Amino acid sequence: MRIGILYICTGKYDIFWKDFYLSAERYFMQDQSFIIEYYVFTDSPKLYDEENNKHIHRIKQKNLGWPDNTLKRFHIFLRIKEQLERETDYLFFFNANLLFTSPIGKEILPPSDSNGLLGTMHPGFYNKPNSEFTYERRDASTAYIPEGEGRYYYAGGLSGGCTKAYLKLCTTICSWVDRDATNHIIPIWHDQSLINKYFLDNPPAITLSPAYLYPEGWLLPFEPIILIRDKNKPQY
Ligand SMILES: CC(=O)N[C@@H]1[C@@H](O)[C@@H](O)[C@@H](CO)O[C@@H]1O
């Protein structure tokens, strides 16, 4: 089975590629049945272990700056959609500063008879009531979610599923992003708002706990499986 990792590390975020990659080569899908393809969108000339591992696919991408780096995130995946359709069976997106600490296996693969989508609970909202979810509340936006509706507050730092269903998600959100641009709207706060809208219409087959998005330094009711490295640490 072929597992595709989508990874954007333009500008000052390629410092995060090395330790992410090593942790991933160690803890992520290390059953010999799986093969891992890294699709690394960056402006870096060379990536760590690129000359050794043929599954590291460097794709050229410039820094768009904030927020287009976060707003056109799914635009970036779809420029190589055909390559993904023939080389991968599952796709997973990870934030640059994410870090694996414990083994992860087939338990996070959405079953083929489901919608084949995976979402992850945001660490700042897992214990909050519906009334405090910061959804997009403007009916003029494609990311609109009325008050009282919604189940979880999903995050944008980790999402995926089977390649077909996920590219379908990429295609939809791009359209939502573009339609709002015309109507003179930037959805707030975008990396999570559009995906929370999509996961409302399409309740994901798998919902990961914030143990898969554990912010460094926090005290949460979970063992951290994936850590969100503090960006403001001096070593970065
Ligand atoms: C994992 C998670 O939810 N992280 C998101 C991620 O999208 C990041 O870019 C930033 C906001 O842009 O912080 C957020 O919490």
Numbering used by the authors: 1 to 236
Text taken from the publication that reported this structure:
Because, like most other GTs, BoGT6a catalyzes the transfer of GalNAc from UDP-GalNAc to water (hydrolysis), albeit at a low rate in comparison with oligosaccharide acceptors, we used an enzyme mutant with Gln substituted for Glu192 that has attenuated activity (4 × 10−5 fold relative to wild type). One (form I) was grown in 0.1 m sodium citrate, pH 5.0, containing 20% PEG 8000 and diffracted at 2.78 Å, and the second (form II) was obtained in 0.2 m Li2SO4 in 0.1 m Bis-Tris, pH 5.5, containing 20% PEG 3350, and diffracted at 3.42 Å. Both orthorhombic forms had four molecules in the asymmetric unit, but electron density for only GalNAc was found in the form I structure. Although UDP-GalNAc was present in the crystallization solution, all molecules in form I contained only GalNAc. Form II crystals were obtained from the complex that had been incubated for 1 h, whereas the form I crystals that contain only GalNAc were grown from a preparation that had been incubated overnight, suggesting that the mutant GT had hydrolyzed most of the substrate and that the UDP product had dissociated from protein molecules in the crystals.
Bacteroides ovatus GT6a represents a GT6 clade found in more than 30 Gram-negative bacteria that is similar in sequence to the catalytic domains of mammalian GT6, but has an Asn95-Ala-Asn97 (NXN) sequence substituted for the DXD motif and metal-independent catalytic activity. In previous studies we have functionally characterized one of the two GT6 from Bacteroides ovatus, BoGT6a, finding that it has a similar specificity to human HBGA synthase, catalyzing the transfer of GalNAc from UDP-GalNAc to 2′-fucosyl-lactose (FAL), and similar acceptors to produce A-antigen-like products. BoGT6a has a GT-A fold similar to structures reported for bovine α3 GT and histo-blood group A and B synthases (GTA and GTB) but is shortened at the N terminus by 45 residues or more as compared with the mammalian GTs. The structure comprises two contiguous subdomains: the N-subdomain (residues 1–97) that includes four parallel β-strands and three surrounding α-helices and the C-subdomain (residues 98–246) that includes a three-stranded mixed β-sheet and a small two-stranded β-sheets associated with two α-helices.
